[PDB]
Amino acid sequence: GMNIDEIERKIDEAIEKEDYETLLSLLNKRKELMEGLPKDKLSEILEKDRKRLEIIEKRKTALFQEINVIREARSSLQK
Amino acid sequence: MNIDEIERKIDEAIEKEDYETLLSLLNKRKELMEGLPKDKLSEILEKDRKRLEIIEKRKTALFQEINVIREARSSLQK
């Protein structure tokens, strides 16, 4: 099966691609490995996950922004 | 810009998913609507119904992308 280093690499690749469905699948496979890691490896992954969360939150807020521009455009197109 | 150029650019902005330009264009178009012939106005209104269907589908896709992100966020917060 896929090792922790490969999974982590692919997780970052998926985030860069903005492929959130594949990100989910990867996190679900990673879930199995988290308890067996050495303490320092787990710590580093958890810190990186914090940075990964920021990246996807940035995108989330940007998607809401785009939806609000669409709502404004609708005001002229509707009726 | 004349009406036919504004209309063309509206459809180009929708295809490019450039909603700020779309909004900009629609604001520019408002000035011209009152002076149009009846048939031209009828054509534009029917086109707007179809344009709105396109952006509404886009809005649905954005909310679905937001939902995927929420799942990923939950998974990263475990």
Coordinates of N, CA and C in Angstrom, one line a residue, chain A residues 8-24 26 52 55-56 59 63, chain B residues 58 65 68-69:
Chain A
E8 N 1.5 12.1 1.7 CA 1.8 13.5 2.0 C 2.1 14.3 0.8
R9 N 3.0 13.8 -0.1 CA 3.4 14.4 -1.4 C 2.1 14.6 -2.2
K10 N 1.3 13.6 -2.3 CA 0.1 13.6 -3.1 C -0.9 14.5 -2.6
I11 N -1.0 14.6 -1.2 CA -1.9 15.5 -0.6 C -1.6 17.0 -1.0
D12 N -0.3 17.4 -1.0 CA 0.1 18.7 -1.4 C -0.1 18.9 -2.9
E13 N 0.1 17.9 -3.7 CA -0.1 18.0 -5.1 C -1.6 18.3 -5.4
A14 N -2.5 17.5 -4.7 CA -3.9 17.7 -4.9 C -4.4 19.0 -4.5
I15 N -3.9 19.6 -3.4 CA -4.2 20.9 -2.9 C -3.8 22.0 -3.9
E16 N -2.6 21.8 -4.5 CA -2.2 22.7 -5.6 C -3.1 22.6 -6.8
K17 N -3.5 21.4 -7.2 CA -4.4 21.2 -8.3 C -5.9 21.7 -8.0
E18 N -6.1 22.0 -6.7 CA -7.5 22.3 -6.2 C -8.4 21.1 -6.4
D19 N -7.9 19.9 -6.3 CA -8.6 18.6 -6.5 C -9.0 18.1 -5.1
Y20 N -10.2 18.6 -4.6 CA -10.5 18.4 -3.2 C -11.1 17.0 -3.1
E21 N -11.6 16.4 -4.1 CA -12.2 15.0 -4.0 C -11.1 14.0 -3.8
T22 N -10.0 14.2 -4.6 CA -8.8 13.3 -4.4 C -8.2 13.6 -3.0
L23 N -8.1 14.8 -2.6 CA -7.6 15.2 -1.3 C -8.3 14.4 -0.2
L24 N -9.6 14.4 -0.2 CA -10.4 13.5 0.7 C -10.0 12.1 0.7
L26 N -7.3 10.7 -0.2 CA -5.9 10.6 0.3 C -5.9 10.7 1.9
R52 N -2.1 23.6 5.4 CA -3.0 23.1 4.4 C -4.4 23.6 4.6
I55 N -4.7 27.2 3.4 CA -4.8 27.2 1.9 C -6.3 26.9 1.5
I56 N -6.9 25.9 2.0 CA -8.2 25.6 1.5 C -9.3 26.6 2.0
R59 N -9.4 29.5 -0.3 CA -10.1 29.2 -1.5 C -11.6 29.2 -1.2
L63 N -14.4 31.4 -3.2 CA -15.6 30.8 -3.8 C -16.9 31.6 -3.3
Chain B
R58 N -23.5 27.6 -12.5 CA -22.2 27.9 -11.9 C -22.3 28.1 -10.4
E65 N -18.5 22.9 -4.6 CA -17.1 22.9 -4.3 C -16.9 23.4 -2.8
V68 N -17.4 20.2 -0.7 CA -16.2 19.3 -0.7 C -15.1 19.9 0.3
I69 N -14.9 21.2 0.2 CA -13.9 21.8 1.1 C -14.3 21.6 2.5

